Amino acid sequence: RERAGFAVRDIHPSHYGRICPIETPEGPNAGLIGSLATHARVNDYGFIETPFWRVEEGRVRKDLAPVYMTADQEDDLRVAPGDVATDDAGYILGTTIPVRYRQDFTTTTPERVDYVALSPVQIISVATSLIPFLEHDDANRALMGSNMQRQAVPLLRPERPLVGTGLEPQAARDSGMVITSPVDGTISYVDATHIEVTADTGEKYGYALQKYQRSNQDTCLNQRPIVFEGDRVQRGQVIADGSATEKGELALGQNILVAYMPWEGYNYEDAILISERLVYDDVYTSIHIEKFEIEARQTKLGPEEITREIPNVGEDALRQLDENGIIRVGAWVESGDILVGKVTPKGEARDVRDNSLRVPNGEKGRVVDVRLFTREQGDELPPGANMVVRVYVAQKRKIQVGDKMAGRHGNKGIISRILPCEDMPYLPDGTPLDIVLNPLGVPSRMNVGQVFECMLGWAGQLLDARFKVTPFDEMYGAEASRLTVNAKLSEAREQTGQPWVFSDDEPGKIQVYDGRTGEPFDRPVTVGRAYMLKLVHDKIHARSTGPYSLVTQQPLGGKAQQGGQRFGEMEVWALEAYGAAYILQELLTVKSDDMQGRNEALNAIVKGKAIPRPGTPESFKVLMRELQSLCLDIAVYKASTEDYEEDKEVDLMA
């Protein structure tokens, strides 16, 4: 990381069709981790290749097979992009065609073009290929949307986009969570955990479905069947689906009613205002499973025992244990609830000590699995352990204030208010909106594609249709996206019969009323159906007093161990610029490592007295000891008051 510089982290003209120029991390890893493009492949030497169609006399030969080519090969040829338009059969239309020759962009007559890229999405990765109307977005927001599409959370009931891009059914068939029938027959047994299909004339095939498992990121890996019993099924037809797929294809978010307008300050600077329907309709609710672990070890005093004979506890807190000291499957555990009961043989009957495992503060849910592993059962336990108990706790999370919501075009936000559906703006038919987004964030971020999808999604809802628009769709016309959206909206208006759906004066805008007063807003606003995602991650943390570090006696860092917040040197500078001296001195000594002043301050606060003056923090004494241990005679001195006296060395370590 320290050796990689500006040159390495950039885009090289040889990445065209082999490495995505969009999908990267942000921060210290920007440009150092990349993603393979959609059509790129690696040959047996280790070089990335990419496919092309041959062009003979200006005719694209799609009859012949794609010719793959590496970066060095395609330097002497004139290669055209995948967005060039050809007529019937294969001839290239136009008089000037953009080509790449020797890592440069030029234009040539379409009789001197050697190769043409296979698809318009050959230059981007799979995550960036799932963004509709991508050519109307900035590249930074395209990066944001592609990165945030991989942080979406599988929801309770997933749903396909209405303005999908065409790669959704292909991005889900490789993860190996969708089950398709390889056989053109009938379905004979359907169950929540099993599917069976009998070939028209042949053997029976049986599939088992994963149910409420757990991923590396605590999400749920469910699998559900789609078909019903006694159903005619064709080969290659979807039979079961994953936790983020609807019927074959990826489904990471939900389609909701959106309006672009400011609320009473709740849309301010990327904040999001949503409706309460997203809470009680179980939109944007997900299942998260966590794993807790307890270990029975062998101490020098003796071994540790898992039992319900826990000290200093009443029978009101041992209700859900299984007469072996371990909680039962299907029990609701709240915060601080005991999961596994353990006793340690302390040395000082009334001798056992309690270190039973409990739910962390801020965690609740159902217990779904309690697996036990002991050396007797033939399991590979750790070197010094005698019982490993693992407990899985599942919970359902709803959308709430503080959660992150996102779109495919780079628009992120944090929910700041959840309004009752009689306070949200509503349509000329009485339908309250689901989400209100600030339009102030659209023109400064140049992610105009979100304003196209919404509108097309609106049409898709009204026409009971689903649109598959592919990126860079303007090779067919001068403004293809706008014309398609306008035509679809007009068709929806004619089919539905409601004239308020689409207006010719303001195409994408319709009248919206105020749920609080019933008065319409001064001007019509843009409403549509938007496909929004709920992002992962449990960040709220607070501390008063907890564990401390070994050498410096300063509070530990980390949510899982009651850690403190770091007061770096920039914050010290900020407090110095304010003129603060007592806040700074209290932060540096009494609240961090004044080993004796911490207890005095806490006792004074509890008793209600005044906090006494601090002393020397422990890190300074540690540093002086380390400097003395480096053969330095550094010391602290008190100056002599009178004339004929020597300065006296002060003993800090007392």
């Binding site: 907890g546 564990p547 401390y548 570090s549 070994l550 530990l556 161990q561």
Partner: peptide
């Protein structure tokens, strides 16, 4: 991140005094 920054210290918690 190092292992030594995840180990608590032996002592009486200010709260338990």
């Amino acid at each position: 991140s190092r292992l030594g920054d995840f180990i608590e210290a032996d002592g009486e918690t200010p709260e338990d005094e």
